Symmetry: C4
Subunit: 216 residues, 4 copies
């Protein structure tokens, strides 16, 4: 039901998503005098917001398979469309990290999200922060799909918190599509089981938690 412009918007968003979000964390993860560490989180959070303004009213700016999933679980999102977005997201992302592999000549750690210390630390973090994000994503979404000025602020804000804090433990992802892309350009795949089960379990738990308390 009008899924072409939805998926072009979902790919073009996920590309500019990953291209920006890793390219500052990857560059920063190679010279912190070149791009600040708080600067790679702020950059990563701002970019989520502007894609909600760009494609939020068209596709919904899902950009996140564990979110497209969470919408299909809780607010009636077309199950016949979730494969098309999942596809659309993984594509724009994986494409980007390679596009940067070439634009950031010296550095070949393109924002790897790899667990720090005990691998489970990340999982508890990657569910609590993903829960957090999906929780607020759901309290602000308008069902065309995550639309509007404050939807951009809420989700971008949540995401930014994740880079600052969950970045010290998990690297801070919450998005199976965005760990995978970079993991391929730098061939480091340490702990990927957590960047699927943290999120999928984080979005569904947090989304479920919202529908619980839903009306006042």
């Amino acid at each position: 039901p009008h899924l072409l412009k939805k998926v072009v918007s979902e790919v073009v968003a996920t590309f500019l998503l990953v291209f920006m979000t890793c390219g500052a964390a990857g560059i920063s993860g190679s010279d912190l005098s070149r791009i600040s560490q708080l600067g790679q989180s702020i950059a990563g959070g701002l970019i989520v917001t502007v894609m909600i303004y760009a494609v939020g009213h068209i596709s919904g700016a899902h950009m996140n398979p564990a979110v497209t999933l969470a919408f299909a679980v809780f607010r009636h999102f077309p199950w016949i469309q979730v494969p098309f977005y999942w596809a659309a997201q993984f594509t724009g992302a994986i494409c980007a990290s390679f596009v940067l592999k070439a634009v950031i000549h010296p550095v070949d750690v393109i924002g790897t999200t790899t667990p720090v210390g005990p691998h489970w630390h990340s999982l508890v973090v990657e569910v609590i922060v993903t829960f957090n994000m999906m929780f607020v994503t759901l309290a602000v979404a308008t069902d065309t799909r995550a639309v509007g000025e404050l939807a951009g602020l809420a989700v971008g804000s949540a995401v930014c918190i994740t880079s600052i804090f969950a970045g010290a433990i998990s690297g801070g992802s919450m998005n199976p599509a965005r760990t995978l892309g970079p993991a391929l350009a730098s061939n480091k795949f340490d702990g990927l089981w957590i960047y699927f089960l943290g999120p999928v379990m984080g979005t569904l738990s947090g989304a479920w938690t919202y529908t619980f308390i839903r009306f006042e």
Copy 2:
């Protein structure tokens, strides 16, 4: 009046409040290479803002026993409900910091708030900056409770100012539930009373100053 979903909202918010705000101040106060010092202030303000968008229209997104007190005094909040939130906040906070003592294993100062100079520095700050916070919280609440896009911007900003400045003196808390959780998940109960009297005297004073200039 329909308080089950309200107190679930007040724990899940105060938990997510402390979990990120302390989880980042705890990591940061251990390796400033691992999390920035300005990043743990920003973290503190953003989490308040997004929690206002998520539970603000349901519970009121108080996430603070010294505020639920302050609204019940001035802007008609249910007194049979203030024990019930105090329960929800002190819980979600105490619950949160413990989840972190473990999730940030090796670091065990779980973002606590303890005075820096003479304790009255903190107490005077923890009333002036807390006076500040409740002041604007009260000017933007619409009474369902602290709800709406700019309600989140105001409070998040206020909290963010507090981490930066009151962080140098008091640690910048303004929230008794957020002090106990951490003070308990590790230890140190240093100045624990100013983080109970600074706030309660700060939120009530700040609310009264606004209700005056209405």
Copy 3:
């Protein structure tokens, strides 16, 4: 004309203005490990924003003698009230820096807006950056007086631009009330005229420029 509650809002705002903006600038300019330098800009701009949300609909959130003057000149504000407000701003600032002198014992330059090198560098910056403020302050004012969600964003943002850049040259004040407060509790009185001729001459010029382009 109903000026009683109007002027209390202007001291509590100007007090809370300086208590944070100087109280963080004073600590920070002393141990840059104790409070970040980017953190002292962000702090100072945020506080302007929250005061505009607090008292903007009551007083207008002037907090600035170069503002109350400029509103009195261009968007018809009461001359019977410009003295009563000018009082409220010079007080809340002077009171705060002293209230700070004690809460921050070891540090005793309680914020300083003091020129860097050539004094004319500061006066030129202190009118152009002050031009920035009054220009936008006027484009977003609703005349009850600087009211509304984006009034807080516009002005708060502008002030933050000033701390970052004009902080490197002048210290970034734009405020006759804000220079006096710290200069009295810190007891450093350099260039005090540029913080009266920079501001007073900067806002009047910037307001005139908005009233000029007023139409599209």
Copy 4:
């Protein structure tokens, strides 16, 4: 069609645009002790946001000839006015960077935008970050011209992201008038062509991508 107030509004912005975005980038680009590296990215973004609040409803706050262009191709902007804004931007930029040359006397690199590595690195960034900017500029435009509270947040956000990331590769400009202004104020012209193809080739690309996904 009522262009006097329109072009005076376009210069005063581009003056205050460059005066601060470079005045902080230059001061920062010398002594990072006097202005932080993230502070000159943030400042670069706040100024775009507040200028949209000041002149967005009058001229539209393009502040960018490659953007003033980008609107003429896609959302019907007066070709008899494209010269008059181009003039206005190239003017206010060149004038401002000179105003600072003198106001920051011992430091005389007045916030230049100069490439880093392979010049194609810089250019490839200056189109995708410029693509990003124009893409969202288009999803939030209201046509009098880029007006409104969230219009400022998106555009300023796009700019702030670019300074963080594209500053590490291209210097992060996306604006031919803003590369020229500083380049003249202290003699520097390396890769000046990417800052004329990065933008022009970048804004047009980003706009078309939205007009594609125009609907839902």
